[PDB]
Amino acid sequence: SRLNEYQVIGRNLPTESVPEPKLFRMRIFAPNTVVAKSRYWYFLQKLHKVKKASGEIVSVNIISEAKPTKVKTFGIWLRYESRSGIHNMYKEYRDVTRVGAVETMYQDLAARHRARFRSIHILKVVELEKTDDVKRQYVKQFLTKDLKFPLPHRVQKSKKLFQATAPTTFY
Amino acid sequence: SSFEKVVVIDGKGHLLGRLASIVSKQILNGQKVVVVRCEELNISGEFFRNKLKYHDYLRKATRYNKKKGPFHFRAPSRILYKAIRGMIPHKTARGKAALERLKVFEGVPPPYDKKKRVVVPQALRVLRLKPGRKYTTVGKLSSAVGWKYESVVEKLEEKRKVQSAEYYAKKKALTKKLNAAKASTAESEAAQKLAAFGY
Amino acid sequence: MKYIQTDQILDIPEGVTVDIKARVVKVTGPRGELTKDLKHIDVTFNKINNRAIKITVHNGDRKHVAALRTVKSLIANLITGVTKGYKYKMRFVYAHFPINVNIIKKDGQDYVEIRNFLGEKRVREVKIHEGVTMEISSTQKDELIVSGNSLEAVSQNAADIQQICRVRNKDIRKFLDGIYVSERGTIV
Amino acid sequence: SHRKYEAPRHGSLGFLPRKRAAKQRGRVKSFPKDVKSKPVALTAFLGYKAGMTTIVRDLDRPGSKMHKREVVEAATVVDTPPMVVVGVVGYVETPRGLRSLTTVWAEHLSEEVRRRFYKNWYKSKKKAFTKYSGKYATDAKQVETELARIKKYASVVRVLAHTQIKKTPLSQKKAHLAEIQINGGSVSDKVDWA
Amino acid sequence: AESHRLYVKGKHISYQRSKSVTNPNVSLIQIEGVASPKDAKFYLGKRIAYVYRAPKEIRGSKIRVIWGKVTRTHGNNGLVRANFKKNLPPKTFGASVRIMLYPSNI
Amino acid sequence: SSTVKAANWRFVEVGRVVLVDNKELATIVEIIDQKRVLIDGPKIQRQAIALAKIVLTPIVLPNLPRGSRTATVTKKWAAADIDAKWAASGWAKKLANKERRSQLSDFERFQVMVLKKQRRFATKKALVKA
RNA sequence: CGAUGAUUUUUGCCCUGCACAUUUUAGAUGGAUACGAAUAAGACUUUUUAGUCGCUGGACCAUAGCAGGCUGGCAACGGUGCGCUUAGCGGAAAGGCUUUGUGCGCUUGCCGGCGGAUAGCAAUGUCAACAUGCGCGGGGAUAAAUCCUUUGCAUACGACUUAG
RNA sequence: ACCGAACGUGAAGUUAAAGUGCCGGAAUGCACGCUCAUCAGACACCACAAAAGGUGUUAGUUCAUCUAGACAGCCGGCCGAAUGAACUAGCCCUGAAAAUGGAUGGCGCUCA
RNA sequence: CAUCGGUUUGGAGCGGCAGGAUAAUGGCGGAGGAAUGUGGCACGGCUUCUGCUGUGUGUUAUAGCCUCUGACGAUACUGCCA
């Protein structure tokens, strides 16, 4: 989707037995805060004896990118469901924002594994600080020194239906 | 976007169905279209694949009387015509008039050999197909399925290109002389004012 | 994966002049000239110097990268065809019936005429491609020498001769008769 | 259900429809392919079927049991008086097929071929080809112009010839006029020959 | 002086329609040179004339007009919806209309 | 000699001047992928953009380090004087002439026609005698 | 779909220059404005090293004058329309593209003089190419087919091959 | 019989389900990938295809060898930098045979 | 045609206010650090060292970049304007 990164913090409802229950935080990539709180309860009921009825959302905050104009390489650890089983995978993306890398990831697993948004768990998104942290060649090839490349065969979009001159593709 | 009296399209290098859809909407909207050089049209996919498709087309014929069945035309212009007519409501009076607005040819016969031919970028093979894909030339598919006049068209096309080259050499020479005269009349009062106006 | 760039380097010997314009390679050497059209491939050429040429594929997928070293090898074969030539040697293999091979000329065309192959009354004729020379070896019994500047033409004439002498309706493990390419080398 | 037993089809589907011919004169669908190096010559002739006869002939066919031995054979006689050449047609190669460009006629046509152009000859003024015959007036430059057009543009040249049916025992007086393609030589050679 | 045109060339393209049902009360008009709704919004409210010829003379003239007006844009490629006093006859699909420059707001 | 015809492409490299929206200049500061770059300029916002949304110009800002920040890009752009180099090309001149033509009024168009008539008179007079 | 022959001695037919009036229109309203080819390439200049052009036709040509009137001058000896006229090319459906000389206009290349109102504050406010008919004028030519009789290379009848 | 929505006679606006290359009103719209089929594929009900396979191509998982020079090739050297195995699942292909000619509705479509 | 009222679709519209990490950035200043290491230096292959270039070294030099941070100043986004 078009996503944002949210910090969602929640807790069990206080009891007379336990008047300060533990606060749990999650980083959720969701299009909006309604899905952010839904995904929060979705993972808490996978990890704790809690429900939305017996729990409480304490805080929802947008986490903005620290350096939205610095080009980074992200490693994303995933857990997705296929038609047959459940698989763990690790993939790498180049982007300036963490959210845009997660958006690329969702498009990429839709394209390469037919994995829908509901079938994917994002275990972890990490910015790879060192060039040695990059394991995948399809993003390692853009970390070479003095990288140049042309864009052969440029196709120009025309405003008119008919053109009086021969097409060209120089660029 | 202008309404033209006749739009003459040079069919060389155009993808068959994309040109067909554009021409269909043009003639439906009251525009007269002429397509020349239908032997130079293109279909995506290898030649063998398109030949197999045409043989599938040839398989279809009325069992009880072959003379009633589909009429499989082999000429490139007629292949383009079939593509267009499939995109036209040809069984209505409006579709019939729209089809009367269209002409398709092999080569560039008179009077269109001395007129302006345009291209349609949305249907050009070099602009549409991914640079590695395979395509077919409709002239070769037509010869492979029964068209008899390939070599006549190419003989007449070589003669036409020789005459058009004599034309172009003369036009270029007179353009060079007119450019030298416009250079002579440059830096004149009218030229300076037209330069301040953008002309 | 769309590899960002892949390169291969031709090496041009001293007397050879490669010449590339719009993917049409013209290799000139002491032995003659050879030409090749490569318009079916998307490659680009850079002259590093008079002795080296870079051949590049930009943003190419696996198959389009695979088509790069084949371009290199074809141009290299042209270079060694115009500087050393090509020579394929064929041996005549027969158990009983000697294979009678002649270099005939009919209708102004050169032909290789195979007679008595496995005793057949049929006369096999193979057209000799332009630029390809046939010779009946004198130093060796039952040997044909196919030579020329073009490796493709030389190997294709040799293959034509080998293929026209196939055995039908027999156990070809036992009936090993035919004309076979025994040596693929260079004239020089 | 399938046929109980197999049998071939009765008759050929390659001769359909089994209708009457559009004309009684059979028309040459295809002429021999032209070879320029050969001399200029006609490729067809018109005759009349007279009847059948019998011959005796010594066979020259080695390996046959009738070799060097007499055979009795049916033969057909075709009465073929000489044909008269009266015209020439030029054909042009077009992306739609051969197209006749021009037909040039001789100055004088005999009555038997001029009857070809009439349904009621006896009631006519017999005006056929009279103005055309006048086209040959003392310079024939119209005729020379048409012949030059044929030489310049035609790729296939055919002559127009008619039978001399008055030399046959037939009571019909109309000649039979047909186009016979000229093969051999250049187009100019063909036009000069015609 | 070779040109005297004070209108923009147009074409009667279609009625307002779904796949199977047409609405003659709205015509779809293509204004020449217009390729976007932003361009077509210049012509909203402008008058439209369909000029045609008829057999009978009326006051010495064989030329008749159906008047209309541009009401709104249509789609994304600069067609407009028009509303004529009498619906344009279906035979005029592809016929040329005149897009007048009035009511002017320049 | 060998005589190899080489391509005259424009390269995606740090320092390439690009047009954005066919109006504004920018320079490539770092390559993200085959499809995306990071662009910056004195009169543009530093952003990640797709190469399809921009047009590479024949101008390179020389000696621009990869990933340079806005201050560095602005300083080197002013030093290399990229604005004048762009404005001196036929491409920018054609863009400017299109803008200028689009700003003419009806009276100015009438004057353009009149002056064109005068220049055509002079041009035909020169051509007929030469 | 093409070539070709002949096309009514009738006041009928063909070609042609006008003049007038009509019917129709799948839809004029400045101009359908002519290389070819490639596209991982083209085209300029030097040099085959390199630089430059494109990045859309928002172009080019044409465009001022009662739907464009009536007159005068200046500068140039050009541009353009029409009429004869010279020569050539074009057969793919050429039916068009060039070209010589001449005559009559116009010229907005520049500067003048006179006229437009009242259609009333809009009403397509009527201006085109194709066709046909009709009046004149000038040239030009002067047929066949069918029925009928006959034939039997044909044939249920039509039709067909013949002859008169 | 499904989805949407239930109905007096009209005008204007907006939608539902479904769509927007042409037939057809609405994008040859913006974008990230995948796929090339000498039976591609193309939208719920629904008008079919499986097990098993493929060094086709893509992306993953876990082991192992690696600059103390990995695999390949010429006889440890020689350029130098990646390599091998098993497994998982996307699209494509094989598996995939029926009778009038014919149906992603048709044309047609291959960075669609 | 004008003005009005009812319904409604729009504009590359313009302005004010609020919130958030009292946005995150960016720019400026300070501190620290590294490499796809700039200059320099030391070796080389082709260069009359003619964007010469490759490999090592190390940390701003004849380019720069990253992290943390200090005081300011904006913008995006989402809301509100009777």
Ligand SMILES: [Mg+2]
């Ligand atoms: Mg066998």
Ligand SMILES: [Mg+2]
């Ligand atoms: Mg046996």
Ligand SMILES: [Mg+2]
């Ligand atoms: Mg049977």
Ligand SMILES: [Mg+2]
């Ligand atoms: Mg339901």
Ligand SMILES: [Mg+2]
């Ligand atoms: Mg539509």
Ligand SMILES: [Mg+2]
């Ligand atoms: Mg399987």
Ligand SMILES: [Mg+2]
């Ligand atoms: Mg697989």
Ligand SMILES: [Mg+2]
């Ligand atoms: Mg299958």
Ligand SMILES: [Mg+2]
């Ligand atoms: Mg459908």
Ligand SMILES: [Mg+2]
């Ligand atoms: Mg109101």
Ligand SMILES: [Mg+2]
């Ligand atoms: Mg800050």
